[PDB]
Amino acid sequence: SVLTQPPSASGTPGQRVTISCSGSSSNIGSNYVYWYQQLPGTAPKLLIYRNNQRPSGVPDRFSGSRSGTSASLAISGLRSEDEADYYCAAWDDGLSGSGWVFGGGTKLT
Amino acid sequence: ITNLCPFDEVFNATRFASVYAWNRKRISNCVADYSVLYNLAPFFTFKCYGVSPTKLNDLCFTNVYADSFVIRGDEVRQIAPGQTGNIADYNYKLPDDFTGCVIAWNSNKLDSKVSGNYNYLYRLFRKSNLKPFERDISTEIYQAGNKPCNGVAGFNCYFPLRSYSFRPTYGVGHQPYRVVVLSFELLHAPATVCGPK
Amino acid sequence: VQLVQSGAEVKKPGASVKVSCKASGYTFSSYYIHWVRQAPGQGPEWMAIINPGDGGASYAQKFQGRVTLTRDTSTSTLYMELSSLRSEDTAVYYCARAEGSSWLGWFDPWGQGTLVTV
C-alpha cells in the first residue's frame, strides 16, 4: 500500500492530540510499526522502536500502540519546539516488490 | 506410553535439506501431541488430505515419515498429488493414493539473504520423469544434442543443476517457503505413536 | 560514531551522478547500510541494501538497474552511482545505518545529506 496518513493535525498548548497511521494487512498486521520524527532544518531522527516502550530516552509522555490494521501515537504537552512532522515505517511483503513503504506527511502546530 | 516425539527437532531446525536431496526420518515409539503445531500464524498451507485435522487426535498410526525441503512460492501449489510442473516431475512427487498431508509457511527472515544465498538448488534437466518417492544424486552432464560430449559442458551439453537466488526484496511467490510432508499407514499393523487417551 | 557525507551540485539531464559518504566509528564489516532519498513535498523512499566486504546488494522494483552500488574495506567508502537522471529525481541523498547483519530493524543515526537537482 502507501500507508495513508492524515495531512495535518493542529492543537493548542497543554492539549493532548493523537496521530495515527492507517494501514492494511501484511503491512501493519504482521510486521512491526515504527515512528520517526523530523525537525525542520535538520536530519530525520527515530522516535520509537517496535511498537512498545521508548527507544533510549525521552519523556514518558510519548507512547503509542497498534490495533488490528492501524497504529496510534499519543502526544500531550504540546510545545512550540515540538512543531514538526512524523512518519511511519514498516515492512511490506507485498506482491512484486517488498521494501520500506513510509507514510505521507503531517503538520503539527 | 513414553515422553514425547521429536516434532520440534524438525520444524525448528536451522539447516533444511534441498529439493533434490530430501531426507526422511524415523519417528516411532514416541507420543505425539499435534496441538503444538498451531503456533505460527502463516499456516496458509495446512490443507490435509487423508484425515481431517480437527479429529486428528483420537486415533493413531503404525509408522510415520517426515520429509522436508525448501521451495519457492509459485510451486507450493504443485506439491499435491497429480500435479504437473518442473519440480513435481523431475525432483519430487507424491503417489496417487497419498495419505498424510503437508505443512507450509513463509520463511523470508531466516533462509534468505541480502547478498543472496546459492545453497538451495534443484534439477531441471533429466533423462525422463521419476517414479513417486524416489531420489537421485548423479551429476552427469546432460547430453541434449546427438553428439558425444563427456565431462565438458556448453552448447547441447548442459549442467543439470541450477541454483535459486533468494533475496529479501522479492515478492510473494518468489520467496523461500519451507515444506514438511508426512505419511501415515493407518491401521494395518500394531500401533506405534499417538498422544493422550 | 557518526557518518559524514560529501558535496554535490546540479547535473545536466540524461547523465550520471556519483554519491558517496565517508564512514567513521563502529565496525565496518558487521553492520548493514540502508540508502534512502527524500524528495521535497512528500516522504522519503527506500533505495537498496548493502553488505560491506562482499558487496552483496539487493534493490527494490522501481529502482533496479538504474542504480549501481559498491563497497570496500580498506578505503571505507560507499559508492552510489545513479544513471539516466531526469528532472523528477531531484532529491536529497541519505546513507543510513541499520541493526547489523539484519535488514530488518530500527535506524541508527543518518547522515547530513547530499542534494542533486536536474
**Residue C33 grid coordinates:** 547500510
By C-alpha distance, which of B107, B104, B106, B103 is closest to B182?
Answer: B103
Beta carbons of B151 and B141 less than 8 angstroms apart: yes
Instruction: Spell out where chain B is interrupted, by the residue before each break (C to N > 2.5 A).
Output: none
By C-alpha distance, which of B149, B129, C96, B128 is closest to A43?
Answer: C96
Check residue B11 and report its DSSP letter. H
Q: Distance between CA B156 and CA B154 in Å, rounded?
A: 6
Is B173 at the interface with chain C, CB within 8 A? no
Amino acid at B5: C
Calculate how close chain C gets to B174, using CA atoms only, in Å.
Answer: 14
CA B35 to chain centre: 22
> Do the Cβ atoms of C106 and A96 come within 8 Å?
no
**Residue A66 grid coordinates:** 497498534
Amino acid at C5: Q
B19, with CB counted inside 10 A (0-12, 13-18, 19+), is buried
Calculate how close chain B gets to A20, using CA atoms only, in Å.
Answer: 25
Domain ranges of chain C: 15-116
**Residue A5 grid coordinates:** 496518513
Q: Distance between CA A35 and CA A46 in Å, rounded?
A: 7
Residues of chain B with Cβ-Cβ distance to A30 below 8 Å are: 41
Resolution of the determined structure in angstroms stands at: 4.2
Residues of chain A with Cβ-Cβ distance to B108 below 8 Å are: 93
Residues of chain C with Cβ-Cβ distance to B115 below 8 Å are: 51, 54, 56-58
Beta carbons of C95 and C111 less than 8 angstroms apart: yes
Nearest residue in A to B175, CA atom = A93
Is B105 at the interface with chain A, CB within 8 A? no
Residues paired with residue B71 on neighbouring β-strands, in sequence order: B177
**Residue B97 grid coordinates:** 493414493
C-alpha distances in Å from residue B69, one per residue of A42, B118, C52:
49, 15, 30
Amino acid at A61: R
Is C8 at the interface with chain B, CB within 8 A? no
Q: Distance between CA B122 and CA C57 in Å, rounded?
A: 24
CA quadruple B185, B186, B188, B194: dihedral, nearest 10: 100
Mutate to test the interface with C, among B111, B115, B118 (most CBs of C within 10 A): B115
Check residue B145 and report its DSSP letter. S
Amino acid at C116: V
CA C95 to chain centre: 4
Q: Distance between CA A43 and CA C15 in Å, rounded?
A: 28
Residues of chain A with Cβ-Cβ distance to C107 below 8 Å are: 36, 46
Check residue A82 and report its DSSP letter. -
Q: Distance between CA B29 and CA B190 in Å, rounded?
A: 11
Solved by what technique? cryo-EM
Is B109 at the interface with chain A, CB within 8 A? no
> At CB < 8 Å, which residues of chain A contact B?
30, 93-99
Q: Distance between CA B100 and CA B88 in Å, rounded?
A: 18
Which of helix, strand or coil describes residue B34? helix
Contacts across the A-B interface (CB distance below 8 Å): 17
C-alpha distances in Å from residue B152, one per residue of B126, B140, B148, B155:
17, 10, 10, 10
Check residue B32 and report its DSSP letter. -
Q: Distance between CA B62 and CA A41 in Å, rounded?
A: 72
Reported as half-sphere exposure (CB side, CA atoms, 13 A), residue B165 has a value of 7
Residues of chain C with Cβ-Cβ distance to A49 below 8 Å are: 106
Residues paired with residue C69 on neighbouring β-strands, in sequence order: C80
Q: Distance between CA C95 and CA C52 in Å, rounded?
A: 13
Q: Distance between CA C86 and CA C11 in Å, rounded?
A: 10
**Residue B90 grid coordinates:** 523431475
CA quadruple B101, B107, B112, B114: dihedral, nearest 10: 160
Beta-sheet strand order (sheet of C56-59): C56-59, C44-51, C33-38, C91-95, C114-116
Beta carbons of B18 and B166 less than 8 angstroms apart: no
Nearest residue in C to A51, CA atom = C106
Helix (H) or strand (E) holding C51: strand C44-51
Calculate how close chain C gets to A93, using CA atoms only, in Å.
Answer: 12
Q: Distance between CA B163 and CA A20 in Å, rounded?
A: 44
Calculate how close chain B gets to A28, using CA atoms only, in Å.
Answer: 14
Q: Which of C38, C46, C106 sits opposite A49 (nearest CB)?
A: C106
Is C49 at the interface with chain B, CB within 8 A? yes
Beta carbons of C81 and C19 less than 8 angstroms apart: yes
Is B168 at the interface with chain C, CB within 8 A? yes
Q: Distance between CA A86 and CA A107 in Å, rounded?
A: 8
Q: Distance between CA A86 and CA A91 in Å, rounded?
A: 17
Topology of the domain covering C15-116: Immunoglobulin-like (2.60.40)
Check residue B9 and report its DSSP letter. H
**Residue B73 grid coordinates:** 512460492
Q: Distance between CA A50 and CA A99 in Å, rounded?
A: 17
> Do the Cβ atoms of B171 and A30 come within 8 Å?
no
Amino acid at A84: A
Beta carbons of C38 and A85 less than 8 angstroms apart: no
Q: Distance between CA B85 and CA B78 in Å, rounded?
A: 7
Amino acid at B6: P
Nearest residue in A to B170, CA atom = A97
Domain A8-108: assigned CATH number:
2.60.40.10
DSSP secondary structure, B78-126, as one string: GGSTT--STTTTTT----TT--SBEEEEE--SSS--SS--TT-EEE---
Q: Count CB neighbours of B102 within 10 A.
A: 19
Nearest residue in C to B115, CA atom = C56
Amino acid at B197: K
Domain ranges of chain A: 8-108
